[PDB]
């Protein structure tokens, strides 16, 4: 089997991407944030504290003839950005772009933190990291990809995120028309539960490539590119007026600037992030100070190849016995 679904930016800045997901019988379609940095499929629901719902579409398990309460199971998650959610668990039928899993754990939120409430465009998350990170207790549950894997034509999924435009998540096949050149594959460590790999270096604009190992995670659920302070400083030094602002919480730059590209290495291959991808717009409405899309990972504890990086590539998440990651230009 295979599946194919369009993923759409939630706003004009590509702050996140939503992908429609069919849950239950009859289908209830929710727009989920596909997150390769976490491993829970959770949804706003009829069980969510009413005051914490503000425009999201909810899953109502009582209206699904295939929903079954997973007795005694609860979940609770906290994300790198400080947000959180928690609740109980059903199993139900879940379909993405034509690919169906029966008996998928659907984690129904009873509580969500303010940032989820405040974002009316995201109805929940669909985790695509390794199932070892799944928070369901007392019996850990598998991700949608883990449940689908054996049935897929090939045990892979691909992320093709657009810049200011829709893109595609594919399951079970590689669309050879969706990228240019070849796909370069690189080793993955699953020891922390992430799609963790080592970039071979970077360049700023038309500058020379610096060969240096950068360990980080391919994370579709993080907006920006988080890299070591040395790398980030080298990037922003090429932008007149750019500075790290403690009060704003990262590097800012004059909105009048033309940003240089940023290149990262995948083995001997190179992925070029155009400058415009690094502009996240005014820090506050009407400001001429703009927020940068490359920021320091110092204090996160890990480097994160988030959407800013991934959207410059066609990315293969290869879930073979020994997982690998593939990157192609597009």
Task: Please list the active-site residues.
Answer: 35, 199
What DSSP assignment string belongs to 169-222?
Answer: EEES---TTSSSS-PEEEE-B-TTSS-EEEEEEEEETTSPPEEEEEEEEE-TT-
193 in the Ramachandran plot: left (φ > 0), alpha (ψ -120 to 50) or beta? Answer: left
Cis check: omega of the bond before 201, within 30 degrees of 0 = no
Exposure of 199 in the CB half-sphere (CA atoms within 13 A): 25
104 bridge partner residues: 92
Q: Do 41 and 104 touch, CB atoms closer than 8 A?
A: yes
What DSSP assignment string belongs to 24-92?
Answer: TTTTEEEEEEEETT---EEE-BTTS-GGG-SS---B-GGG-TT-EEEEEEEEEEE-TTS-EEEEEEEEE
Calculate the CA dihedral of residues 309, 312, 317, 322 and round it to 10 degrees: -70
Residue 318 phi/psi, 5-degree rounding, is -95, 110
Q: How many other CB atoms sit within 10 Å of the CB of residue 118? A: 12
Counting every residue, how long is the chain?
Answer: 330
């Amino acid at each position: 089997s295979t599946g194919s679904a369009t993923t759409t930016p939630i706003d004009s800045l590509d702050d996140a991407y939503i992908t429609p997901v069919q849950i239950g019988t009859p289908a209830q379609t929710l727009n989920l944030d596909f997150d390769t940095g976490s491993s829970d499929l959770w949804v706003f629901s009829s069980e969510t504290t009413a005051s914490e719902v503000d425009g999201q579409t909810i899953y109502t398990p009582s209206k699904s003839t295939t929903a079954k309460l997973l007795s005694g199971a609860t979940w609770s998650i906290s994300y790198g950005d400080g947000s959180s959610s928690s609740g109980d668990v059903y199993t139900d039928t879940v379909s993405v772009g034509g690919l169906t899993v029966t008996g998928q754990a659907v984690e129904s939120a009873k509580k969500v933190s303010s940032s989820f409430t405040e974002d009316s465009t995201i109805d929940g998350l669909l985790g695509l990291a390794f199932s070892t990170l799944n928070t369901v207790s007392p019996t850990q549950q598998k991700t949608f990809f883990d449940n689908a894997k054996a049935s897929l034509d090939s045990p892979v999924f691909t992320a093709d995120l657009g810049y200011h435009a829709p893109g595609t998540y594919n399951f079970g096949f590689i669309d050879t028309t969706a990228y240019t050149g070849s796909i370069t594959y690189t080793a993955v460590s699953t020891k922390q539960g992430f799609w963790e790999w080592t970039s071979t270096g970077y360049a700023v604009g038309s500058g020379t490539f610096k060969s240096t190992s950068i360990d980080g995670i391919a994370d579709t659920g993080t907006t920006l590119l988080y890299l070591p302070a040395t790398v980030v400083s080298a990037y922003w030094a090429q932008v007149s007026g750019a500075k790290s602002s403690s009060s704003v919480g990262g590097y800012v730059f004059p909105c009048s600037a033309t940003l240089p590209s940023f290149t990262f290495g995948v083995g001997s291959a190179r992925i070029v992030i155009p400058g415009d991808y690094i502009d996240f717009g005014p820090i506050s409405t009407g400001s001429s100070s703009c927020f940068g899309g490359i920021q320091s990972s110092a204090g996160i504890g890990i480097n994160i190849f988030g959407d800013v990086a991934l959207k410059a590539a066609f990315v293969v998440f290869n879930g073979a016995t020994t997982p690998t990651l593939g990157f192609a230009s597009k």
